[PDB]
């Protein structure tokens, strides 16, 4: 894939102040919580203590037919990047080197009020960089209608239900679950967030260009008298 290497470059956002965000996009930086499952937003977004990038895009149920405003449900997908070690001492965010990824967490949410149907999917890759094939270090978690309780391990009698790792599923020709999983969902999931991460950096980096130009333009106003 080599995509997770490109996700390392996105550590320039820790010391960059974020103001420009696309529609229905949420981003903040923080520190890992208890057991490192998720991220907790920090009181300061410019502190060097931040090691987690939180990116979230939320939508609505029924927006494919123009019925988003009817409040038929909620949905959001978020991806979190985890880094190890502290950030560099210089406050300039432009000069930052790529850093290893502790884990990559994907959180898929879709709740339908009318059908009373909810689907929550969590995918954490605890070995992003270090090995091309790490199927045993890719955790999955599927829930539906609050069943099973969070953190319930997969049992052999009920395959796929609850928390489990990618290696537990098969990849035969009859049921190429793993081949389909990589080709359909995960590869495209990484690319969309990868460009979206570069999207936010370019927008806010552009903001610095405008302010420098604005002061020069204001100075030229004295050339007419």
């Amino acid at each position: 894939s080599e995509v997770n290497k490109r996700l390392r470059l996105h550590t320039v956002l820790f010391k960059m102040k974020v103001r420009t965000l696309p529609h229905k996009t949420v981003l903040y930086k923080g520190k890992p919580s208890a057991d490192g499952e998720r991220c907790e937003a920090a009181d300061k977004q410019e502190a060097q203590d931040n090691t987690c990038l939180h990116l979230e895009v939320f939508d609505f149920v029924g927006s494919e037919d123009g019925k988003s405003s009817k409040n038929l449900g909620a949905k959001f997908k978020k991806m979190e990047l985890f880094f190890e070690g502290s950030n560099n001492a210089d406050p300039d965010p432009r000069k930052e080197q790529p850093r290893n990824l502790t884990k990559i967490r994907t959180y898929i949410y879709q709740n339908n009020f009318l059908l009373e149907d909810k689907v929550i999917s969590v995918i954490a890759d605890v070995a992003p960089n270090g090995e091309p094939a790490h199927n045993d270090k890719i955790e999955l978690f599927y829930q539906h209608d609050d069943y099973p309780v969070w953190g319930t391990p997969e049992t052999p009698s009920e395959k796929g239900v609850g928390k489990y790792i990618l290696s537990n599923v098969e990849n035969t020709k009859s049921n190429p679950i793993r081949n389909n999983f990589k080709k359909q969902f995960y590869f495209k999931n990484l690319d969309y967030f990868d460009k979206l991460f570069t999207k936010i950096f370019d927008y806010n980096d552009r903001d610095s260009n405008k302010h420098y130009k604005k002061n020069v333009e204001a100075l030229k106003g004295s050339l007419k008298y």
Partner: protein
């Protein structure tokens, strides 16, 4: 402290006894699982209007519209700046009189004014949708959360500013009075500067159309109250500006000797 940093109203997931109740209820719903069920009596299913998931989606719907409305205002400001830049850079090979410049300059003002009011109207529709989403949350517990108070004041402020540009001054009074009743918004002098102008419009209309004197005094009384309060919050009490306004207000109202 960005209350809108996380982009949600209330976070969602403790007691072992409570977790026992959640287990049996989920077992009960599994026996009676009927995705096609529709309730003839809507009272029980309307209890979902009090749920935290319901309020979460309402807040995210209102938040979605608010970003659209601000985008229209801000994208418009970019266009006007860009539009003026392009006009100055093009070559006017057929203009050798001052009156021609004024005619060319006059067209640009109308083009600029035409796009602004178009953009202001788009924002107000976007802002108005956000207002209705915020007002269909029936739990007072969730309406006191700092996330709600942040967007509710933000929505009203953007709605009022767009409305005043469309010259719909009398509609800003009901919204502004609700705006200055949230957190410390009453301490903001612009909120009392707008109500100073909006209530003056009301007094002029009552004076123009010759309405009752009771409504005339009410709008005059409200105009001077918020004119003074706005002056105090910006120039401070017993200041030269404050003394001037008190003289104006004393002349404007009735004093019994």
């Amino acid at each position: 402290v960005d209350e809108l940093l996380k982009g949600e109203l209330v976070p969602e997931n403790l007691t072992e006894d409570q977790k026992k109740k959640k287990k049996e209820i989920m077992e009960q719903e599994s026996l009676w699982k009927n995705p096609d069920f529709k309730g003839y009596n809507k009272t029980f299913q309307e209890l979902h209007q009090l749920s935290k998931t319901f309020a979460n989606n309402q807040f995210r719907l209102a938040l979605s519209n608010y970003q659209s409305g601000v985008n229209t205002i801000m994208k418009n400001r970019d266009w006007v700046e860009q539009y003026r830049k392009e006009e100055a850079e093009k070559k006017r090979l057929d203009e050798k009189w001052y009156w021609q410049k004024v005619d060319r300059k006059a067209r640009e003002e109308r083009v600029v004014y035409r796009e602004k009011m178009k953009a202001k109207q788009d924002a107000l529709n976007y802002f108005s949708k956000a207002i209705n989403h915020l007002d269909e949350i029936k739990n007072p517990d969730l309406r006191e959360r700092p996330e709600f108070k942040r967007l509710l004041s933000d929505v009203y402020r953007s709605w009022i500013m767009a409305e005043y540009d469309l010259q719909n001054l009398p509609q800003t009074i009901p919204i502004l009075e609700l705006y200055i009743e949230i957190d410390d918004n009453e301490k903001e002098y612009p909120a009392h500067k707008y109500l100073a102008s909006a209530y003056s419009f009301e007094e002029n209309m009552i004076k123009k159309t010759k309405g009752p004197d009771d409504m005339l005094f009410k709008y005059r009384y409200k105009k001077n109250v918020h004119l003074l309060r706005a002056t105090e919050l910006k120039y401070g009490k017993d200041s030269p500006e404050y003394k001037h306004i008190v003289n104006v207000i004393n002349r404007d109202e009735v004093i019994s000797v």
